[PDB]
Amino acid sequence: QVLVLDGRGHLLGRLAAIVAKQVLLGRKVVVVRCEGINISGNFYRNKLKYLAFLRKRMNTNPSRGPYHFRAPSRIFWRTVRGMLPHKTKRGQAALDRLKVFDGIPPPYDKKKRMVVPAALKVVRLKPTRKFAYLGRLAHEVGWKYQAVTATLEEKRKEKAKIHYRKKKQLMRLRKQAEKNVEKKISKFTDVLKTHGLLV
Amino acid sequence: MKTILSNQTVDIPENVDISLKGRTVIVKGPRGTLRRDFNHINVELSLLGKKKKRLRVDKWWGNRKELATVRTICSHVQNMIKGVTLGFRYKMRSVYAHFPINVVIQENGSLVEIRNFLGEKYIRRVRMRPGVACSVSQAQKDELVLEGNDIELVSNSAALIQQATTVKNKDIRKFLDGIYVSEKGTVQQA
């Protein structure tokens, strides 16, 4: 009863638009690997937009001003907060439901992370428009932890490769087993084929 | 308009054998192997003929600024096959007015120390990007010969040393000093 969304290949505010309404309707949504979120438009326009957000600062005491978060997780958290009614109790309950991480931490490396096709770069951009990675933008604007995230990601992609070879060889044992037992399951198989489950 | 189809082919000689792995192309031949990754250009690359003699690049439904890119792949692959089967050689001449420009070549072709340019004491160390070898020529007074496979690496390493020898704060039209690219061309003639 928790939506584990992936973040790679998704447009920033176009993912945040679905996430905002889906959290106001009561889900607990965990958008994971947020540094792989990309934004449309080219990287120099996008970092000029974020540097303009940096210079927008309370003049007399910038401690009270806009907290320009630098990590990609909290950039995406700030844009979901912009799309939620967060001055009030239901918007604050929604922000309490949304959890947002950089990379894939170990409550969620073992779980199967979802996608949103409606907010995805190969669906909602022309293939010749330039885009901009939010992780690289965050690193250019002052996020400190790109390199440690990338090394932890190559570690988890190795360990996921191990899990995937194990799952492949289990699936191949399953197909050799079904080939070896079709003589005494082909009566059970045949009524799953007449109801459209194996054709 | 959105033009329905535009294509060009690339004739391929016999001593070489291109192979395309999806959209990145890998040219192997006499001198060395080199690749280039066309995954930014959104076209189709057929490899046709047996002996694989032709590379067809075609683009379907392309407007003007994208049909511009349908023969620039042909130009990159033509320059690619040229640099594989023949290699590239840029000879660049060292022009001075009074102070002679002293060039020494360290790390067997990979770093260039330029000295005495305009009488400056700041010595210039320029590193060739990999695969390019700089060399002082013979039977000619002031040359630097840049050998390599592909022109982007070779001509980039040439432009680095040309912009390294530059005149600042004075009249660039009178003070015609520096090392300038004179003779682009080939290692082995065909």
Partner: protein, 247 residues
């Protein structure tokens, strides 16, 4: 309207929360970045200020007007007894920073260092690490320790060794010793923990850490001067004599 005569700004905004320091001894905000091609060495030490003195030395800088002449120079004597190493701390690099992994203390911790764990050494019964130092003289405790050393060898990235001053040898009033994490910079993590657990529980002098004529950085809180005003603190220009509510 603007300011008639431009003039640079009093004070620095870089040091801006000009409050009392939240800690008495100066903390190293950043140790030097390690490279594994060094031998293993300590990147900090901890001495106490004593005073000031002249010297006379013959300066060798060629070209200068004081070449081969003899300047005098103010020096500062930092009395610096050998610190005793007591524990090691390991750190794992996380996408939220660098968290601590597993602090490991030695068996015999001297009462110099034991006073640091107590706000009141008189009223207590001096009970710190009594349940902990039974983990060194039994087999289950020793191989639990070898388990966490093996976990520190493979999950930690930065290793900081714990060291305290040796306060008996100092003429001060106090006895409660200063404890400090010193980062061990040097070779790979196996070499680093082997060095650290071999030199665990024993001393290290200054000459293991620094050398003669080595530029260092000095960290500490300044000399406190109390609640003071803008002329005394920010060095603004005093308003003239005729001012009604104070100048």
């Amino acid at each position: 309207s603007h300011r008639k005569f431009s003039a640079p700004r009093h004070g620095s905004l870089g040091f801006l929360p000009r409050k009392r320091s939240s800690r008495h001894r100066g903390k190293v905000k950043s140790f030097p970045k390690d490279d594994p091609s060094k031998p293993v060495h300590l990147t900090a030490f901890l001495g106490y200020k004593a005073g000031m003195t002249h010297i006379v030395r013959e300066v060798d800088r060629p070209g200068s007007k004081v070449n081969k002449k003899e300047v005098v120079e103010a020096v500062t004597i930092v009395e610096t007894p050998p610190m005793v190493v007591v524990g090691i701390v390991g750190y794992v690099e996380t996408p939220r920073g660098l968290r601590t992994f597993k602090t490991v203390f030695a068996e015999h911790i001297s009462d110099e260092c034991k006073r640091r764990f107590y706000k009141n050494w008189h009223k207590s019964k001096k009970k710190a690490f009594t349940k902990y130092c039974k983990k060194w003289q039994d087999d289950a405790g020793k191989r639990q320790l070898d388990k966490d050393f093996s976990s520190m060898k493979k999950y930690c990235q930065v290793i900081r060794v714990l060291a305290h001053t040796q306060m008996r040898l100092l003429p001060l009033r106090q006895k409660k010793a200063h404890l400090m994490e010193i980062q061990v910079n040097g070779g790979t993590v196996a070499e680093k923990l082997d060095w650290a657990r071999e030199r665990l529980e024993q001393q290290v002098p200054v000459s293991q850490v620094f050398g003669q004529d080595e530029m260092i950085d000095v960290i500490g809180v300044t000399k406190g001067k109390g609640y003071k005003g803008v002329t005394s603190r920010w060095h603004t220009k005093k308003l003239p004599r005729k001012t009604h509510r104070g100048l």
